[PDB]
Design a protein around this motif. Structure first.
Motif, PDB file in Angstrom:
ATOM      1  N   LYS D   1       8.413  32.836  -9.236  1.00 15.15           N
ATOM      2  CA  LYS D   1       9.157  33.218 -10.427  1.00 15.15           C
ATOM      3  C   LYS D   1       9.200  34.734 -10.576  1.00 15.15           C
ATOM      4  CE  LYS D   1       7.358  33.083 -14.478  1.00 15.15           C
ATOM      5  NZ  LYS D   1       6.737  32.653 -15.762  1.00 15.15           N
ATOM      6  N   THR D   2      10.293  35.239 -11.138  1.00 15.85           N
ATOM      7  CA  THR D   2      10.467  36.657 -11.419  1.00 15.85           C
ATOM      8  C   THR D   2      10.433  36.880 -12.927  1.00 15.85           C
ATOM      9  OG1 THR D   2      11.922  38.562 -11.145  1.00 15.85           O
ATOM     10  CG2 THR D   2      12.948  36.402 -11.401  1.00 15.85           C
ATOM     11  N   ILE D   3      10.645  38.130 -13.334  1.00 13.02           N
ATOM     12  CA  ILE D   3      10.665  38.509 -14.741  1.00 13.02           C
ATOM     13  C   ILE D   3      12.030  39.037 -15.160  1.00 13.02           C
ATOM     14  CG2 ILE D   3       8.198  38.863 -15.097  1.00 13.02           C
ATOM     15  CD1 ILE D   3       8.906  41.941 -14.614  1.00 13.02           C
ATOM     16  N   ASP D  43      21.662  38.903 -21.630  1.00 12.29           N
ATOM     17  CA  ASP D  43      21.850  40.126 -22.396  1.00 12.29           C
ATOM     18  C   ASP D  43      22.928  40.959 -21.720  1.00 12.29           C
ATOM     19  OD1 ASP D  43      21.742  42.576 -23.728  1.00 12.29           O
ATOM     20  OD2 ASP D  43      19.912  43.193 -22.694  1.00 12.29           O
ATOM     21  N   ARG D  45      25.091  44.646 -21.941  1.00 11.86           N
ATOM     22  CA  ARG D  45      25.246  45.986 -22.485  1.00 11.86           C
ATOM     23  C   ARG D  45      26.536  46.588 -21.960  1.00 11.86           C
ATOM     24  NH1 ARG D  45      19.684  45.554 -21.487  1.00 11.86           N
ATOM     25  NH2 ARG D  45      18.429  45.865 -23.375  1.00 11.86           N
ATOM     26  N   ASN D  47      28.787  49.915 -21.912  1.00 12.77           N
ATOM     27  CA  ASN D  47      28.811  51.363 -22.075  1.00 12.77           C
ATOM     28  C   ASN D  47      30.227  51.828 -21.748  1.00 12.77           C
ATOM     29  OD1 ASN D  47      28.600  54.141 -21.888  1.00 12.77           O
ATOM     30  ND2 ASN D  47      26.770  54.143 -20.592  1.00 12.77           N
ATOM     31  N   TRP D  58      16.070  37.821 -18.426  1.00 11.74           N
ATOM     32  CA  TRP D  58      14.628  37.995 -18.420  1.00 11.74           C
ATOM     33  C   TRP D  58      13.927  36.657 -18.243  1.00 11.74           C
ATOM     34  CZ3 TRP D  58      13.594  43.257 -19.459  1.00 11.74           C
ATOM     35  CH2 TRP D  58      14.628  43.962 -20.076  1.00 11.74           C
ATOM     36  N   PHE D  59      12.811  36.681 -17.516  1.00 20.35           N
ATOM     37  CA  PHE D  59      11.927  35.524 -17.366  1.00 20.35           C
ATOM     38  C   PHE D  59      12.685  34.324 -16.799  1.00 20.35           C
ATOM     39  CE2 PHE D  59       9.666  37.413 -21.275  1.00 20.35           C
ATOM     40  CZ  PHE D  59       9.106  38.390 -20.483  1.00 20.35           C
TER      41      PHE D  59
END
Lengths: 147, 201, 102, 185, 35, 180
Positions: D1-3, D43, D45, D47, D58-59
């Motif tokens: 597993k990654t983060i 998520d 973002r 710009n 994440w996670f």
RNA sequence: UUGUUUUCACUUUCUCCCCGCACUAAUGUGGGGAAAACUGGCUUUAUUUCUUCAAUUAUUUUUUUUGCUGAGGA
RNA sequence: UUGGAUAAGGUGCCUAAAUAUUCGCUCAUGAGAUCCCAUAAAAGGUGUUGGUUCAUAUGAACUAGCCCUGAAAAUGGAUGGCGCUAAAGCGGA
């Protein structure tokens, strides 16, 4: 080789959908287990779900490991080193006066006033009642005059 | 538990856990009412719930359907029958517990002007991982033959307009009262002003 | 207004139960706002049960039953109460007073 | 597993974008598109000063890590489709009964006849935002154009699927309407 | 108690040293048995 | 410190010897460190390992020393590589795993939970071997590799877990798992 | 035929350089290199209430709130 | 008979007691939930989790946990029901 006003304004307005990271040195409020109800500082990380935690000796909590599920991350943050320990942590916490910042937001004020309120005694309770009744008379007078 | 009645909004709640809390409240002599049953949620796939209700419809006593287990289709009565099956309804105490519960699909009139309560042990976001399939029970009812959904939605928006009007008016009133209180705080004696300011009242 | 209370309300539940095994010796009492055993132990005090009657019994329409809260039951702040007489099971759900005195 | 995992999608030149809690709307020279993402923990973002969008998750386990590229590619196709129209070139095949195609109802609801000489109308509706005509180059040629890749592809697929025969050996009876080319205008 | 503390450090140090030597010997035997 | 939070594993050090016999005057004293709940289980497991490797049991042997090994520093971050020997329902395997936490006790407890969750390997069907601290460079599993980056940080998506004091059955309005 | 000795490789950064020069999850960042040493670790002196004296076992000592029972009659 | 404290067993409700903590796995368009005890196999799976053996973060070959297929019977039907997916399922502490 820099980015001036563009960079500053952009960052600010960019506004990260996630704040209050778990970066070492964060301020947290334990909210489960016997220690719950005190402020603490995250020292470093052992894994994703298990994390160390240790507030300075001001709050009265030694250095153990607490599962992260019990924490509640707060707005503020300090700038300790990764290898910091309780001594330098107690130095830097009073250097920064982070707890003064904490007990000045809405949450900190609510916490301290709740502490004082449920500490208070019957005489202070009745003083509050009489003061509230005096203020109620004043407010009803004012509202009746406003018409 | 200690009020004359409770009114429970059913926004984003799970049928089983909601039924558990409702039944445990009912068994201790407390009157509970549920509203907006069309928004009950069920953990699982829409087609899985449809299949289970299809099997339920398939089931029927062969001798005489009149004595058959009443299938029902209204979401309110679905929740009611779930609670009945989950509560000891065959005794007198259980019968009282069952008949102390009232539910109505969508908003009725005498309940839109009482504070709604939300039970934090059954909210979908809390008690479900975001990546796993869920359902909306009103759509299931429509599939299994309710045919009274769009009407409830139109009534909902019609109530929502008046609700926004009332909320803005009461916000105006509350913001005026706060100003009145803050302005009248200083006409009282210093001892009382300090008594207020010490505890934030 | 008037008619001070200085008591807390409680709800009567079943007796000291066990599935298909009755034990009509104690009574289970739940309190207003207590939620844990650590705060439920705070109550070892007297309890008054008040109920009405259709006709007068001793010159008044009200008679009462006394008792004492013995020991906490379980983890969720429910207590065991022992009374001079067994509570009739007609009482489940009615309000009972836990008096500040003693 | 990654983060933590992420990808970056460059924003093309003439497109204007607007995202709000994974609800994206995108205007341009050739229309507007709106797509949701609420079924995904993600998520985003945006710009717009330096273009591009950064999408992070994440996670994650590989199951939910797969959809990150689905999101990035779908956004890229949205921007490409709003700057330049998506187009599909279709060809119709007729062995002994020439296929009849009639274009009516202001570029929608084409009718087809004479497929095996059935003398029965085979027609299909068109998704909104899709314009379908016959090209000025070759008779059996059909242009489908639009903004959404999904809309144009669904219209093409419905056209392809609303003509098939029954109980006929397809391995020899090769008549039908198929997909020749994918194109950008 | 400093003399006893030194002795305890020494004895536990020797224990861990023996364990580490056992680890290294097992690793070397595995490398030999590999080919 | 909370008893619920803490586990119940302590590293133990056992030295034993067979009774000196006429046939063999001085036997080779044995020594070994193992993990167990307490000293009695440590002695039992130690003697079981004796019976399985060397020809020796309780009756024709005895103990010499039984001590408890505790950590040098309880609040450091290390990396631990542990070899195993377990038996499946159909076979017997060995494998090498990595873990990161404060002490060997927590490492063994985490390992036991890992085995129970991932292979349904019940406690009695396990054997620990050659557990040792390892450097950051030589760790062999990426899911512990990424933990030791230069400066870690991440959000706190964990849902709230409030006390029984406030886990009430009713509330004012719907809360948010978003929090910060 | 075991003990004994040796080599390198090991951390903090809100330090700086070069390449990308804005590339980040990031109020910064990837890779290649410089830096001492506040961070951290060790050896000294005096103190422990500015702050801990932990956890467990052996041997003792109390304590805070209260439920139930009161047999017998020398 | 009166109190206390337990055994097996349970702690979502029925049903007295933990929506207790903490550690991993599980998406089932016929999931799973105690020995006796009230059936399921040979063979498979490019589902997913963890390993071992080899080859220059990639290719193969194996290996075992859960899950899917295999899996069909007559009054309507049963983990006891309800229902249960950040479990109230699985295996622990």
């Amino acid at each position: 080789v820099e980015l001036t006003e563009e960079e500053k304004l952009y960052i600010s307005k960019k506004n990260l959908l996630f704040k209050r990271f778990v970066e070492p040195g964060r301020l947290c409020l334990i909210e489960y287990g016997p220690y719950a109800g005190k402020l603490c500082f995250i020292v470093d990380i052992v894994t994703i779900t298990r994390v160390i935690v240790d507030g300075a000796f001001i709050t009265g909590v030694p250095r153990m490991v607490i599962p992260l599920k019990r924490l509640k991350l707060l707005k503020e943050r300090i700038k300790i080193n990764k290898n910091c320990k309780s001594g330098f942590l107690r130095k830097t916490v009073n250097s920064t006066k982070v707890l003064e910042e904490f007990n000045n937001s809405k949450l900190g004020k609510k916490m301290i006033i709740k502490k004082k309120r449920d500490e208070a005694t019957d005489f202070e309770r009745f003083q509050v009642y009489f003061a509230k009744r005096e203020l109620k008379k004043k407010m009803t007078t004012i509202k009746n005059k406003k018409n | 538990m200690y009020k004359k009645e409770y009114v429970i909004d059913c926004k984003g709640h799970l049928l089983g856990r909601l039924a558990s809390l409702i039944a445990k409240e009912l068994l201790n002599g407390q009157r509970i009412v549920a509203v907006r049953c069309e928004d009950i949620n069920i953990s699982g796939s829409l087609y899985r719930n449809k299949l289970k209700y299809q099997e339920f419809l398939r089931l029927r006593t062969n001798t005489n359907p009149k004595k058959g287990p009443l299938h029902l289709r209204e979401p309110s009565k679905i929740l009611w029958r779930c609670v009945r099956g989950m509560l000891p309804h065959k005794t007198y105490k259980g019968q009282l517990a069952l008949k102390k519960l009232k539910v109505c699909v969508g908003m009725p009139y005498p309940y839109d002007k009482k504070k709604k309560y939300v039970l934090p042990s059954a909210l979908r976001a809390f008690r479900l991982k975001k990546h796993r399939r869920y359902c909306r029970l009103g759509t299931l009812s429509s599939r299994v033959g309710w045919n009274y959904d769009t009407l409830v939605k139109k009534n909902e928006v019609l109530r929502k307009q008046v609700s926004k009007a009332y909320y803005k008016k009461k916000v105006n009133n509350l913001n005026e009262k706060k100003e009145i209180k803050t302005e009248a705080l200083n006409l009282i004696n210093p001892e009382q002003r300090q008594v207020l300011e010490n505890f934030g009242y | 207004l008037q008619a001070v209370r200085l008591y807390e309300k409680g709800v009567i539940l079943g007796y000291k139960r066990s599935q298909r095994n009755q034990d009509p010796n104690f009574t289970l009492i739940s309190i207003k706002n207590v939620n844990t055993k650590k705060h439920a132990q705070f109550y070892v005090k007297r309890v008054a049960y008040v109920y009405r009657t259709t006709k007068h019994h001793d010159g008044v329409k009200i008679k009462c039953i006394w008792g004492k809260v013995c020991r906490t039951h379980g983890n969720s702040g429910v207590i065991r109460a022992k009374f001079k007489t067994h509570i009739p099971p007609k009482a489940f759900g009615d309000r009972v007073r836990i008096l500040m005195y003693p | 597993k990654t983060i933590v995992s992420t990808q970056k999608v460059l924003i093309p030149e003439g497109v204007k974008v607007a995202i709000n809690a994974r609800k994206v709307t995108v205007s341009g020279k050739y229309g507007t598109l709106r797509r949701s993402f609420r079924h995904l923990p993600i998520d985003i973002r945006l710009n717009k000063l330096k273009k591009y969008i950064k999408v992070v998750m994440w996670f994650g386990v590989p199951d939910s890590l797969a959809c990150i590229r689905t999101v990035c590619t779908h956004l890229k196709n949205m921007f490409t489709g709003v700057t330049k129209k998506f187009l599909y070139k279709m060809r119709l095949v007729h062995a002994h009964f020439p296929i009849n195609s009639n274009i009516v109802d202001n570029n929608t609801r084409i009718e087809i006849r004479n497929y095996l000489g059935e003398k029965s109308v085979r027609f299909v509706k068109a998704l909104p935002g899709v314009v379908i005509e016959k090209s000025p180059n070759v008779k059996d040629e059909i242009y489908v154009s639009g903004a959404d890749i999904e809309n144009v592809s669904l219209t093409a697929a419905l056209i392809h699927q609303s003509v098939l025969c029954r109980n006929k050996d397809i391995r020899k009876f090769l008549d039908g309407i198929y997909v020749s080319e994918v194109t950008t205008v | 108690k400093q003399i006893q503390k030194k002795e305890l450090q020494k004895i536990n140090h020797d224990y861990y040293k023996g364990v580490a030597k056992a680890v290294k010997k097992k690793k070397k035997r595995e490398e030999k048995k590999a080919k | 410190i909370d008893n619920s939070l803490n586990t119940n594993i302590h590293q133990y050090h056992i030295v034993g010897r067979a009774i000196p016999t006429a046939k063999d005057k001085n036997p080779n004293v044995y020594r070994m460190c193992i993990f167990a709940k307490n000293d009695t289980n440590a002695k039992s497991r130690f003697w079981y390992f004796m019976k399985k490797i060397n020809k020796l049991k309780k009756s024709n042997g005895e103990l010499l020393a039984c001590e408890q090994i505790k950590e040098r520093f309880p609040l450091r971050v290390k990396n631990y590589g542990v070899l195993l020997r377990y038996d499946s329902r159909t076979g017997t395997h060995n494998m090498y795993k990595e873990f990161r936490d404060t002490t060997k006790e927590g490492a063994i407890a985490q390992l036991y939970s890992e085995m129970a969750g991932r292979h349904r390997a019940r406690a009695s069907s396990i054997n620990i071997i050659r557990i040792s601290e390892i450097s950051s460079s030589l760790v062999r599993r990426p899911h512990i590799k990424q933990l030791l980056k230069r400066r870690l940080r991440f959000p706190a998506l964990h849902l709230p877990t409030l006390q029984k004091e406030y886990r009430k059955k009713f509330a004012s309005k719907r809360p948010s798992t978003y929090r910060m």
